[PDB]
Amino acid sequence: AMLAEFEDRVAGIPCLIVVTYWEPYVPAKVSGPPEYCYPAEGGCGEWEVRDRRGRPAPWLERKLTEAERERIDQAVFDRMEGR
């Protein structure tokens, strides 16, 4: 569904980011013998740009650059991993 929404910007234009899937971050096991160690999991998911009413915003989606996608990826992580 629609897990969370927050106000942000795409190339300076106000929008809503809606998070549609979130895989919770699960820490790696690093302490102790290597035989018991394992990598981290999750800390990623799926999000979309929307207008302030939560409607599709294809005109903003087209304005996303890879730089913006990377910045918003981190904004989503911080929102979903917050308290």
What CATH number does residue 12 fall under? 3.30.300.260
Range of the domain at 16: 1-83
Q: Which residue has the tokens 């904004």?
A: 75
Q: How many structural domains are present in the chain?
A: 1
The three-state DSSP-derived secondary structure of 43-80 is CEEEEEEECCCCCECHHHHCCCCHHHHHHHHHHHHHHH
Distance separating alpha carbons of residues 33 and 14, to the nearest angstrom: 49
Beta strands 13-23 and 4-10, pairing class: antiparallel
What was the resolution (in A) of this experimentally determined structure? 1.3
